[PDB]
């Protein structure tokens, strides 16, 4: 009945889950997979219960029957009275970021540049930006637009993996899990910060979180915001402060998914679990925090205040919204009702 097998992607996430599992008295247990796609398979098979997922993977998962349960919620300034759990989710701002010194570089001079993506099939990293780029260009040749990239999940032998580093040993080049140096929001941003790339497709929170002494991490301590710039679709360039008026799209929050025959029970264990290890949780600061991993967004983005109830008991199409659901479907014409397993 009341035991949840969570699916960790990669070895860094397995160690946070094991610790979570240590402190939960087996209320949560951990399966492990190499890539998000594999984890979705494990949950389909019933060998794992649930996992937190970027909107891009939620669309894959959805075609395969999986259902969103709870969603991540960050610090908000509208909806002050409402408790985090009952508070509506705001989404997040996909942005294209560049280095200020890289003068001249505009959304209209991206062709043949170098790019940093979070991973293939994710929202801010891949689907919005590449979606705009296929539309604007009239061609599915997205593999020929940037000269070199790090798009974790693309063919290791391809130009789309050229700029990825792999792990400390140089192994696992381009793998779509935290072992890649330039995987996910932080890695894609680092990718630009180290001047490995000309542009990084991350979200707004990422720039702020890793700049102005916020990360303390070796590669990020000396980073200042004012050395960065966003690329608007109006061909302009703005400071990281004008995010609301210079973004590519608003992205539906990452959410936990499960099989629907389990959602009721996944939902219950987790609400309890967060009362214990969440932002103001009984045993967070002292013993263990579910929502902290030191700029590494492991299992959950470090900016999650809490996971929140959904309300409108929404399906996956409704959760992602008809706007975004069309964006992906158009883009998948390039690579029409499926379940890719
Ligand atoms: C892109 O992503 C960035 C990073 O994620 C994000 O920046 C982050 O924003 C959040 C909030 O959205 C910041 O957190 C906040 O920081 C402050 C200061 O350290 C914290 O302290 C205060 O918290 C108060 C309690 O919530 C807050 O009250 C708020 O509510 C009151 C009343 O409801 C209201 O206050 C107003 O004050 C007026 C002046 O006297 C007064 O006349 C008026 O009547 C009014 O009541 C405001 O609504 C207020 O927001 C205080 O205002 C303080 O904020 C606070 O708890 C919270 O922790 C993050 O620090 C920040 N990240 C970084 C790295 O700085 C960007 O904003 C994102 N960009 C976009 C476009 O979304
Ligand atoms: C890449 O490029 C493709 C090709 O253009 C693009 O796909 C297209 O996206 C469009 C926008 O997302 C789609 O148009 C949509 O809007 C209409 C209108 O409905 C909306 O407007 C009304 C009034 O303003 C609102 O009240 C309503 O809430 C909607 O927001 C949609 O169809 C409408 O449906 C309503 C139902 O209430 C009817 O009453 C209307 O008469 C009308 O039929 C439509 O379903 C779209 O959501 C367009 O459909 C879509 N084209 C194709 C072939 O799929 C991608 O979005 C681009 N991608 C990226 C990344 O930009
Ligand atoms: C594992 O989960 C169970 C279910 O919530 C917890 O046992 C309940 O905990 C609450 C709070 O202590 C009690 O009020 C209930 O009486 C307990 N029993 C039930 C309802 O079965 C337990 O606390 C969790 N264990 C850990 C270590 O997190
Ligand atoms: O406008 C963006 C919105 O898109 C979707 O409906 C999401 O479910 C919601 O979190 C987000 O606020
Ligand atoms: Fe995302
Ligand atoms: Zn907008
Ligand atoms: Zn509905």
From Swiss-Prot:
Hydrogencarbonate 2 binds at residues 118, 122, 124-125. Fe(3+) 2 binds at residues 54, 92, 185, 254. It is found in: Secreted; Cytoplasmic granule. It comes from the Eukaryota. Residues 4-333 form the Transferrin-like domain. Coiled coil: none annotated. Disulfide bonds join 7-39, 17-30, 64-339, 84-306, 116-191, 140-334, 150-164, 161-174, 232-246, 284-289. Belongs to the transferrin family. Transferrins are iron binding transport proteins which can bind two Fe(3+) ions in association with the binding of an anion, usually bicarbonate. Lactoferricin binds to the bacterial surface and is crucial for the bactericidal functions. Has some antiviral activity against papillomavirus infection. N-terminal region shows strong antifungal activity against C.albicans. Contains two BBXB heparin-binding consensus sequences that appear to form the predominate functional GAG-binding site. This is Lactotransferrin. It comes from Bos taurus. The lineage of its organism: Eukaryota, Metazoa, Chordata, Craniata, Vertebrata. The gene is LTF.
């Amino acid at each position: 009945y009341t035991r949840v097998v969570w699916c960790a992607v990669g070895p860094e996430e397995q160690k946070k889950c094991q610790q979570w599992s240590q402190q939960s008295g087996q209320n949560v247990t951990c399966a492990t997979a190499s890539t998000t796609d594999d984890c979705i398979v494990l949950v389909l098979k019933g060998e794992a219960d649930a996992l937190n997922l970027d909107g891009g993977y939620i669309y894959t998962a959805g075609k395969c029957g999986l259902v969103p349960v709870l969603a991540e919620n960050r610090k908000s300034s509208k909806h002050s009275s409402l408790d985090c759990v009952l508070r509506p989710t705001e989404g997040y701002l996909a942005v294209a970021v560049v280095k200020k010194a890289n003068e001249g570089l505009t959304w209209n001079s991206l062709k043949d540049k170098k790019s940093c993506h979070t991973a293939v099939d994710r929202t801010a990293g891949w689907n919005i930006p590449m979606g705009l780029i296929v539309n604007q260009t009239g061609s599915c040749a997205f593999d020929e637009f940037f000269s070199q990239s790090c798009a974790p999940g693309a063919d290791p032998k391809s130009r789309l993996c050229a700029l990825c580093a792999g792990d400390d040993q140089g192994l696992d080049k381009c793998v779509p899990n935290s072992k890649e140096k330039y995987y996910g929001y932080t890695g894609a941003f680092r990718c630009l910060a180290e001047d490995v790339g000309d542009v990084a497709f991350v979200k707004n929170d990422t720039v702020w979180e890793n700049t102005n002494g916020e990360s303390t991490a070796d590669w990020a301590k000396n980073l200042k915001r004012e050395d960065f710039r966003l690329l608007c679709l109006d061909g302009t360039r703005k400071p990281v402060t004008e995010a609301q008026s210079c973004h590519l799209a608003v992205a539906p929050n990452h959410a936990v998914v499960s099989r629907s025959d389990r959602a009721a029970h996944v939902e219950q264990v987790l609400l309890h679990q967060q009362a214990l290890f969440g932002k103001n949780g009984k045993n967070c600061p002292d013993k263990f925090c579910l929502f902290k991993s030191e700029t590494k967004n492991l299992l959950f983005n470090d900016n999650t205040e809490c996971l929140a109830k959904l309300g409108g008991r929404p399906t996956y199409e409704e959760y992602l919204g008809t706007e975004y659901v069309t964006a992906i479907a158009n883009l998948k014409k390039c690579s029409l009702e499926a379940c890719a397993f």
